[PDB]
Amino acid sequence: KKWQVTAINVGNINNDKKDETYRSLFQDLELKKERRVILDCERDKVND
Amino acid sequence: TPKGSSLGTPVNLAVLKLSEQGVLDKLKNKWWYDKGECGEK
Numbered sequence: 001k002k003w004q005v006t007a008i009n010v011g012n013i014n015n016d017k018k019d020e021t022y023r024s025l026f027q028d029l030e031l032k033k034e035r036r037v038i039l040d041c042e043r044d045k046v047n048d
Numbered sequence: 049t050p051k052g053s054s055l056g057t058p059v060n061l062a063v064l065k066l067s068e069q070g071v072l073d074k075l076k077n078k079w080w081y082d083k084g085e086c087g088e089k
Binding site for chain 2: 033
């Protein structure tokens with residue numbers, strides 16, 4: 001389908017790290033101007 | 049920006065975008081003319 005997909009593993013992160021890694025990730029998504037996101041997670045991680 | 053930085057493309061597109069929507073002209077006219085001293089008979 002000629003799709004450009006940036007695949008990130010959110011699976012392994014320390015609970016102590018928490019928000020910080022997410023901040024880094026979403027900022028890096030903002031610099032790439034990626035406005036479209038697929039979560040692919042269970043309800044817990046989706047909520048986080 | 050430093051070579052191979054992650055900010056290069058974003059700042060490039062940033063300058064372009066800010067240029068096309070006329071912000072640069074606005075700031076230029078803001079800090080040069082509008083605040084100038086010199087503006088009958």
